[PDB]
Ligand binder design. Structure first.
Ligand SMILES: CC(=O)N[C@@H]1[C@@H](O[C@@H]2O[C@H](CO)[C@H](O)[C@H](O)[C@H]2O)[C@H](O[C@@H]2O[C@@H](C)[C@@H](O)[C@@H](O)[C@@H]2O)[C@@H](CO)O[C@H]1O
Ligand SMILES: CC(=O)N[C@@H]1[C@@H](O[C@@H]2O[C@H](CO)[C@H](O)[C@H](O)[C@H]2O)[C@H](O[C@@H]2O[C@@H](C)[C@@H](O)[C@@H](O)[C@@H]2O)[C@@H](CO)O[C@H]1O
Ligand code: NA
Ligand code: NA
Lengths: 456, 456
């Protein structure tokens, strides 16, 4: 096991810009919304696509109020109907009566995303149930690549290209062997800042669709994980990144951080029968604390109705999720403790200076690295937040948190494994004088760019 | 030919940062210096490595004076002797009398480069005439990855990893092949910002070691060039990227810009007999004008002597080189021209603000994109300098430049094909009132971040 190797695997600059987005939105919309399905059958009549009240500004307003950093639109789902006027097939909005055949929903969405300060990403299903070339090999690749080129060069900066693994062809279906390597070269060449996700090397599907977050989430994982979703370790395993899980891989490991994806409803597309099963503001806020406080990026889907609007319950939950995240952020930014450290005290101000590029790192011979955060007055708290300077790698393996009570006893307030981008370690309301964070397990010396004790 | 794909192939942000360096130094130094050889045989006595006056600060001052942005050290050449105390072999400085076995020349160079404002890069020869694992396959990959690991984690940020492709049979009669893809994973994981050069995807050997520069240099080229150093295309071919040369490749092309490498002496390592064969300031400045005015990076090797200093003639030529370059940059930044454009006047000021991140692009239906630069007084000029916003791709195919003389007549000054990072287009001295740059061939609308008219 070479810890100078493991402890120094680092995010690319596109991975690090992505990680700081934290939470962004999925928008599953199109033919499936019109036909009320989760998967379409292919060859749907384009006359079915006639939403009478498409209001992307209403979607974006609600995503801004929800604290979203960007939006990923389903520009072509498995059914093959394209939401832009592709020159490569007639199975698009141009063949539909929406906007008299002059519409381009990718343009409307990306333009409105930008006006509202949200990044824009594209979902482009490799699986296609309409396209005649699908199953033919190379001729389908050329079609796909030609569609990537349209999406990546006509609509401005793309932050994510999301490549779904789903394939329902079955034992007797069409067999298409995607030329993934040729697709990557296209994406890298045209949008080199974009992250290629799921069936791609930059961002890893966390391995469930229900919003479950691992107890420990390693961004440093075996390199074969980048092929997991493509065609025996699996995106689903609970343990991917522990010393024990990675040792036999040696250098054949990489930075490949997790994205937790889930829908606000049981389905990805809008179904009216799901209006009473829309996740609430607090269930969403809990998901957020859990994911964004658990080294996991959060991709939350909110499907527009066939009228072409986000439904009321969904807008209410998003408004409420954004109020909560925004009070959290406000709390973190305005708390004020004095920080003391077990060693390298000259750098203790880095833990509390509001600067994500400065960090504290204990001397290499410090046998028990610890941070103590002393509150200006005795205070009721119920979380600590801690961040690693993940530019420099992911190190922390165990963290134990203790609290000094005003009577002068101390309680073990809670423990966690991995930190990474951010750990929000939650516990019961408790009034304390100070907290100590015992970083008692690490892969070489940890680099900690923020620490705070907070009341959520 | 798909122009919508070609005109939109772009550099990664790491290739973009490397391009802004322009010129940086090679330092070939080590066992071969001590035995006065261009190639070592392997198994050299480590007592031979005993330079008496290693003074890397003296190297770095001379390189700063020469205008270099960085330096790339041969941390191990083909002979196999390591300039740092590697844990994977005893064929290193730890076995030599240099600093009584306690030296690390890699540490000395990288720390001095950093003090001097210079980036640091490493050359680590895959070919190894000493290492006993060479020729055994995976076991030599293990070794090599192990040494790459030391170099990429122990010495701060690395701007380039420069990989030469040569191979040989080992002491077992068998040829070593290299697990390239495995090496790239190491480099990408530990130093995400580094460019992997020559035998690597990010930076292309220009195809000669004589300082020759193509008339037209395309950074958009067939993707197979990335394997050329690992009729077929060669790195040496004159035409790699014209519409004719790339047409057949469709999207299997990429951003792979040229690096022109050459030595300030006939050999790469120092030889006392070559002290009277050091290229002069003027030769080196014509080389700079040619490469850095021809969309090529310049990598200039200056080898330290067996006593451990850059020799006087080398220092002197560096000094004069740096002076001419600095006069060039003065002429570039002190001309006060008014810029007018054939379309999109609102963006004209982007031509002259000295900012590489703003550019002018003519209207979609401007049929004759042109820039006229008006001098404050009739002035003698003998070059134009033009730079494309290469962040967005490389598009210019032909440029024609005319001059307006004070007597109201017009002269055709010169023409050039490619531009890329920068074209310096020189021509017979002439006094003009203004000059016009007619971009009369381009892959879609050109994007130009600087245009100037100068006296060199
Ligand atoms: C194991 C599993 O969840 N399988 C099917 C889903 O596909 C996986 O989806 C995830 C993303 O959650 C990832 O791409 C894997 O590579 C796929 O195998 C499937 O969901 C698909 O992804 C959704 C985001 C959505 O676009 C959906 O329409 C798409 O088919 C779901 C469909 O409900 O079925 C799973 O059984
Ligand atoms: C085609 C050629 O020049 N081959 C031999 C050189 O190798 C090429 O070096 C260039 C860089 O100029 C590039 O890596 C190619 O892929 C190599 O094939 C060879 O030079 C090697 O490169 C120098 C930078 C230097 O480090 C040298 O020691 C090393 O051998 C030279 C040796 O002089 O011979 C060529 O015939
Ligand atoms: Na900080
Ligand atoms: Na500019």
């Amino acid at each position: 096991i070479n810890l100078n190797y493991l402890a120094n695997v680092r995010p690319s600059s596109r991975q690090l810009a992505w990680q700081r987005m934290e939470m962004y939105a999925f928008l599953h919309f199109g033919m499936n919304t019109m036909t009320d399905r989760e998967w379409g059958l292919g060859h749907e009549d384009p006359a079915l696509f006639n939403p009478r009240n498409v209001d992307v500004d209403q979607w974006m307003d609600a995503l801004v109020a929800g604290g979203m950093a960007g939006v990923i639109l389903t520009c072509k789902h498995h059914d093959g109907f394209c939401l832009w006027p592709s020159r490569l097939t007639r199975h698009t909005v141009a063949s539909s009566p929406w906007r008299e055949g002059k519409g381009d929903l990718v343009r409307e969405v990306s333009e409105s995303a930008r006006r509202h300060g949200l990044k824009f990403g594209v979902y482009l299903s490799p699986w296609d149930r309409t396209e005649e070339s699908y199953g033919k090999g190379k001729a389908y690749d050329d079609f796909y690549v030609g569609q990537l080129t349209e999406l990546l060069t006509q609509y401005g900066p793309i932050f994510s290209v999301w490549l779904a693994g789903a394939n329902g062809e079955g034992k007797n279906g069409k067999t298409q062997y995607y030329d993934w390597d040729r697709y990557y070269n296209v994406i890298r060449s045209l949008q080199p800042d974009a992250v290629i996700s799921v069936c791609g090397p930059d961002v890893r599907w966390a391995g469930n669709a229900a919003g479950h977050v691992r107890d420990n989430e390693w961004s440093v994982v075996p390199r074969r994980l980048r092929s997991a979703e493509l065609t025996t370790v699996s995106s689903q395993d609970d343990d991917l990144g522990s010393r024990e899980a990675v040792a036999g891989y040696g250098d054949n490991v990489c930075w490949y951080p997790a994205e937790v994806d889930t829908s606000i409803r049981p389905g990805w597309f809008y179904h009216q029968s799901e209006d009473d099963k829309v996740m609430s503001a607090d269930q969403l806020f809990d998901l957020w604390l859990s994911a964004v406080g658990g080294n996991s990026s959060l991709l939350l889907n909110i499907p527009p109705s066939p009228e072409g609007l986000l439904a009321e319950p969904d807008v209410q939950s998003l408004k409420g999720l954004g109020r909560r995240v925004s009070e959290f952020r406000e709390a973190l930014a305005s708390v004020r403790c004095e920080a003391r450290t077990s060693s390298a005290s000259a750098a203790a101000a880095h833990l509390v200076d509001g600067n994500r590029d400065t960090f504290w790192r204990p001397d290499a011979d410090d046998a028990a690295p610890a941070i103590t955060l002393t509150l200006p007055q005795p205070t009721t708290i119920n979380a600590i937040v801690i961040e690693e300077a993940i530019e420099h790698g992911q190190r922390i393996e165990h963290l134990r948190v203790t609290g000094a009570l005003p009577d002068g006893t101390e309680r073990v307030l809670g423990q966690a494994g991995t930190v990474g981008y951010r750990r929000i370690l939650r516990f019961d309301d408790v009034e304390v004088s100070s907290v100590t964070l015992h970083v008692d397990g690490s892969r070489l010396a940890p680099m900690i760019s923020r620490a705070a004790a907070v009341r959520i």
